[PDB]
Each structure stands twice: as structure tokens, then as C-alpha cells.
Structure 1
Amino acid sequence: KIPRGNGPYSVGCTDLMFDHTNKGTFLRLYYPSQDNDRLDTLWIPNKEYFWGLSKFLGTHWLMGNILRLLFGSMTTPANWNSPLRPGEKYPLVVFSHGLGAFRTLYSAIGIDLASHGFIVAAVEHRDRSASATYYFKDQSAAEIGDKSWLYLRTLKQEEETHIRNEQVRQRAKECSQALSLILDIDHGKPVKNALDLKFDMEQLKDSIDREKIAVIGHSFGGATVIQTLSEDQRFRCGIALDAWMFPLGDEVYSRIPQPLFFINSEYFQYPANIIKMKKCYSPDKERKMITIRGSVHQNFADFTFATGKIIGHMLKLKGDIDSNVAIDLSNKASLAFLQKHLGLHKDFDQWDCLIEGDDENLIPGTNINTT
């Protein structure tokens, strides 16, 4: 089970695609909900995500069918299409998924953020870093729900530097474009969702605290955080969850004026990666780094809750730390960081000491010795 949020708000979930093309925005929205009696949200909504996943894992597409058999009816505890809780402007997080992932796979994070009074836009990237994604060739195809699927691109070694850097830049543009979409919906612009869903986007009118905007992401998405901040000053701070820094151009490192928080797993990180994180440091910049003791790369994704302890450890989906314990640390330290750098009037400062890595399951800074 994906954990429910720890916050006081009930959580709703919906999908938004606008426009309908490969260049439009696709996001999953997590939001404080009025009601708490809807159907739970389907975690992986289409068979083709499973084909994509099994390509990314390097198995036959028929393994996709077995993954579908095992995981295809799994839900996440968010009220599908629930009405948005009224009477309050909400801060906004744009969320970027890792390589081989897609918009739905960080609901433990998205639900928890939403339960504390955030609207969360988890983008689905069309850079061919997702396992799978879909869009519509044209208006006719959108109208009859005739989906065109785009699958993960495998790179030759010669393509790595260049294609990863082209992808992190498209990712950033996709994050800004998602933000401008939500801001326009907030500023009342009528938008026709390319998905025929029973959630009126008009609910989102006057619902965003327009100055309180952050960008968060895991792995490839953690590099997207940094690229996004350097390109789009509307984002006021970012949190890179076990960022994979390789996609970033040399030019970005001196170009990040916003506060930036690195939350790392113990077992993923390596010198080349930590050196790149340290290249983001400057005495006039706000920078923080913590490491979750006992944790693996996938402790930030929902896959860490999808299996039992033994199979989980085997598939490197779980570390020595309990998954609920690890995500609570990452989500609480994130909440405190967001309160500080967005100027929120909540009680998230109760977790300020986690920003400093002051917990029995936290390492301040990094365990990684560089030079």
C-alpha cells in the first residue's frame, strides 16, 4: 500500500492534458479535496505503461502483461475526481519523474504534499525519458480517445551526453509550460481538457497562491529541478530528490539563485554526482543536503510500496530502512524547507531540524567522500 497523506487535508486526484498534442502539457494533479468518499485512484491506468515498464527493465513485452496481471488493479489513496477543497489559496509544486517513470509513480509524495495543503502537478514528460506516455495526433483523434503512444528511448553510449542534456532542457520547458497552464486556469482561462474526465478545471480558478511555487523531482527529475530553476524564476525554490546530475550542462551550475535542497539516498550516490551537486554551492546561495540512512534510489518512488520486504530488497526497491520511515523523513524535511523558502504560515517548521540532517535515520550532508 501507498501510504495516505500525514496532513489534515483529504486528497483528490485527476488528470489534465492540454493541448492534446505531443507538445502540450500532460500532468496528474493532487489537491486538497472537499470530499473523502470517492473511488481510490488507479495507480497505473493503462496496459501500455506496463509494456513501457518492461522495455525499460529490459524484459520481453509479455513480462508487461504479467506486471499488468499483478499490479494493474492497484490503487493509490486519493479520491479520483473529488471536488477541490474551496476557500483557500494553495501553494503549487510542479513534480518531475525519473527515467523509466511517468506521472503516476510518485503519489506517496504527491498525496502527502496535497494532504498538507499543496496543489501538486506531477508532469508526464514527452522527451522519451518516460517508460511510456501518450498524446493525440489531432483534434479528431483526441475526441474519440484514439491514443498515440510514445515509448522510452534507449541510447547508444555516443548519444548519452547530448541526448540527456536535450531531454533535461525539454523537461524544464515542460515544467514551465505546466506552470503557465495552471496559472492560466487559476487566472480563469477556459481550458478544454483533452481527457473526458468528471472534474471541472474551473474549480481551480482563484485557488493558487501564485507567489508560492516550487519545483520537486526525483533522479532525472532532480536534474530537471535544477535546469528549471535556472530557466524560470517563477519557481521560488526546488528540492532535488536523489538527483542524477549527468544531464545538466556546465553552464547551469552558476545560474541557480533560488534555495535548493538535495535529499539523497545512502546507496545511490557516488563522487562524480556529489561533485556536480557541490558545483551548485556558492556563499550567497541557500543550499542544504541530507542523506537518508539505509536508503536506496527507489525509496522516493511508489515502487518502494508495491512489494513485500524480501522481494522489495531483492529488486533494489527497498533499503535497510523501512519505506514509510524513509518517505516520512523526505516529505517532512521537504515541508519544512518549503515553509522557509515560500514563506508559508503553517506548522512545517516543527521539522526544521530534518533540513539539518538531525535525526537518527539522517546523515547531515553526504556519506560520500570526494577527493
Structure 2
Amino acid sequence: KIPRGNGPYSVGCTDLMFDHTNKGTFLRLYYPSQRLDTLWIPNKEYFWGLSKFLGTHWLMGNILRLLFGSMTTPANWNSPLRPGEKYPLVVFSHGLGAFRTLYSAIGIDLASHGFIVAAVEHRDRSASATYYFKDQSAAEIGDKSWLYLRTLKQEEETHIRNEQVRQRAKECSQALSLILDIDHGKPVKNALDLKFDMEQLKDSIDREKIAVIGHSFGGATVIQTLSEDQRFRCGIALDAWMFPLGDEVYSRIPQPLFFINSEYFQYPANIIKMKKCYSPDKERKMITIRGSVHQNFADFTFATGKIIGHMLKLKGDIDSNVAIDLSNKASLAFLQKHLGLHKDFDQWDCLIEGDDENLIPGTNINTT
């Protein structure tokens, strides 16, 4: 039910954890490859964590497991990397209560247009669930240590969310550094024991065409990561939740920055913070997909029927495939303009400006 990528490349998918601790990097890789069998949500504990995030008990955990536990996503698991070329790199940051696998609609479509996409799994305790290993012995027998989402008291939110977004930007940088090191032949031992050799990635990254993309909490991570890591050349923030960011960051984003909003998530206090990032000497774009809801950017907008997805706030008015296509095409055109790609994604340059029936330029919210 998750749409196949619309590009000409076929898409592989694998997982990489290095090192094995909770300070290491944990990402899912989508990439052009040389079967469509990747498990969407691969462990029972992610369903338990999703149930705690949603506010239900042990029951709703196993129910979610029974419904989706073997649902796949259209990527060739451990398929070989399509050799011959250098690929641009997107680092992707998930929202609160999500984890590394819940944005394959976006990851797989970018990979089919020639990107390698590194979807990181954050260990800031903003994920529903993630895991690490206490030592190499535990990794050798696959004995996972799970860390679940921390819920916060209202008195804590401001401080903790900002520390979390700094830790998330740190993890996006650490993912980039690892991928850039593998590109130069640094040897890695995947703490997971998968049939994909990371040596395939040697001399396979275009080290000047790096972008960071994020949804919600991940949208704030785009801004913190851009502010801190000059190696990233542009950012796309999908329905960014701006709260975690401190006041000092908004005037300290040099790179091109694209805001892609849904209609029904946004509110003035959030829009004003996006507007604090604007400067006449900096490249900023903003569009809003009409009729869309927060969840149109994550994969659960494709996991249920129209009527119940509409009921659970997983679907909006706009068709879920029309929304992700608009957002993906606008992203591809923006990436081409600011990464310098020699592709034909500028056919969608009208979308960066909101020139579609299903798009608003900027936002319908007004601020001072």
C-alpha cells in the first residue's frame, strides 16, 4: 500500500548500526540498486512503543502488531548498490514517536531518482522505540536493549526538547561523518549481521551534494543540523515543529531552506518561527499542500482505508498519493536547484512556488 518510487532507478534497502552502543549511528539506507520484500516495521517492540506513544496499554500494542507486523515496503532488501556513478546524499530525521522506517514513501521515491537516503534512528528518546547492544557479545547473539520514548512533564518541555534537538542534530552529523568515512574506504562492522557489504559504498557518494530532510520534530532537526554542520548544502523541513529550537538558531542558517507544510497542522506561533528564519540575503521557500494533515508525510497515511484513515487523522482531504507526490516533486526540484544536480527535476520548479491547484504559496496563516 506504500507507493513504489516514481523514478527510473530500482531501490534497495538495508540497515546499518555502527558502532553497537547507543552513542553509535543507527540508520536505514535507501539507494539505487541493481523482489520488493523489506519488512516495514521489523520488531514487535516498535509496536509496543507506538502503543505507549498513542496513549494505550499492552493490548493496542499486540493489535497493531497483528495488523501491520508483516506489511512490507516496496524496496529490495539487501539488493546490491547500482554501481558506476556517484550519488547525492540525503540524511533524513523522523518525528516524535516515529523511528527510522516510517518514511519509506519519501525515502524510496528519492532513491528511485538517484539519491542515497540515510534515515537515522534517533536515540534522544524521541523515538517510540529504538535499540542498541550493551556489548559485542550481546550483538553477536542479537540480544537487544530497547529504549522507549520518554514522556515529559510540562515544566520540562522547553529545556528537554531543545537538548533533544541538539542531540538529534549531533546524530545527523554523526550519520554523515560515518557515511563519508565509508565512502573513503573506512572499514565497518555492522552490529546487525546483514547480507549487504558496506564496502559497496566506497567512492559512491558525491561528497558536495549533501542535504538534510526532516518531518515534524525532524523538521526542527533540519534547522539545528544546518546551523551546526556546514557540510550540509540545503535543508527541506516537512511540517516542522519549531518549538524545540532556541532563539539563537533562526538567524544562523546559511544554507537554502525549504518549508513544506500541511494545512491542518500549522498555527501562528509555529509560522512566526519559520518567518524568523527569513533574511533577504538567504534562500527560503515555503509551500502548503491544501487539505493535508500532519500525517500525510509519514507512511501510516497509506496503511488504512480512506474512511478510517480519515477518522484516525491519518488522512486529510487531499488524496494521500497526490500529497506525497506534490511534496516529493517539490523536494526534488529544490534539491536540484541547490545541490546542482544534472537531472530534469526542474520541470517541477512551479511547485517550489506553489503553482498547483493543490498548493498555496507560503501559508494561509498571517503573522506580523
Q: Partner residue of 2:5?
A: 5
Separation in structure 1 between the aligned mates of residue 150 and residue 74 of structure 2, nearest angstrom: 31
Separation in structure 2 between the aligned mates of residue 43 and residue 33 of structure 1, nearest angstrom: 18
Q: Partner residue of 1:243?
A: 240
Q: For residues 254-292 of structure 1, give each alpha carbon's deviation from its aligned partner in whole angstroms, at most 9, with x where no partner exists.
A: 110000000000000000000000000001000000000
CA contact (8 A) 2:288 2:362 kept: yes
Q: Partner residue of 2:262?
A: 265
Identity value in percent: 100
Separation in structure 1 between the aligned mates of residue 23 and residue 58 of structure 2, nearest angstrom: 27
Q: CA shift at 1:144, angstroms?
A: 1.1
Q: For residues 160-203 of structure 1, give each alpha carbon's deviation from its aligned partner in whole angstroms, at most 9, with x where no partner exists.
A: 00000000000000000000010001110010000000000010
Q: CA shift at 1:139, angstroms?
A: 1.2
Separation in structure 2 between the aligned mates of residue 351 and residue 170 of structure 1, nearest angstrom: 34
**Would you say 1:180 and 2:177 are equivalent positions?**
yes
Q: Partner residue of 2:334?
A: 337
The SS at the match of 1:251 is: helix
Q: Partner residue of 1:156?
A: 153
**Would you say 1:62 and 2:56 are equivalent positions?**
no
Q: Partner residue of 2:44?
A: 47
Q: For residues 38-60 of structure 1, give each alpha carbon's deviation from its aligned partner in whole angstroms, at most 9, with x where no partner exists.
A: 35110000000000000000000
Q: CA shift at 1:143, angstroms?
A: 1.1
Q: For residues 281-321 of structure 1, give each alpha carbon's deviation from its aligned partner in whole angstroms, at most 9, with x where no partner exists.
A: 00100000000001000000000000010000000000000
State the number of aligned residues.
368
Deviates more, 1:89-98 or 1:38-47: 38-47
CA contact (8 A) 2:5 2:112 kept: yes
The SS at the match of 1:98 is: coil
Separation in structure 2 between the aligned mates of residue 61 and residue 363 of structure 1, nearest angstrom: 42
Runs of 4+ in 1 over 4 A off after TM superposition: none
Separation in structure 2 between the aligned mates of residue 29 and residue 206 of structure 1, nearest angstrom: 16
Q: For residues 57-101 of structure 1, give each alpha carbon's deviation from its aligned partner in whole angstroms, at most 9, with x where no partner exists.
A: 000022110100001010000000000000000000000000000
The partner residue of 1:220 within 217, 222, 228 is 217
CA contact (8 A) 2:36 2:73 kept: no
The SS at the match of 2:249 is: coil
Q: TM-score, normalised by structure 2?
A: 0.99
CA contact (8 A) 2:88 2:115 kept: yes
Separation in structure 1 between the aligned mates of residue 305 and residue 229 of structure 2, nearest angstrom: 40
* RMSD, aligned α-carbons: 0.5
CA contact (8 A) 2:256 2:338 kept: yes
Q: CA shift at 1:333, angstroms?
A: 0.2
Q: TM-score, normalised by structure 1?
A: 0.99
Separation in structure 2 between the aligned mates of residue 184 and residue 108 of structure 1, nearest angstrom: 27
Structure 1 residues 180-219: aligned runs within 5 Å: 180-219=177-216
Structure 1 residues 4-153: aligned runs within 5 Å: 4-34=4-34, 38-153=35-150
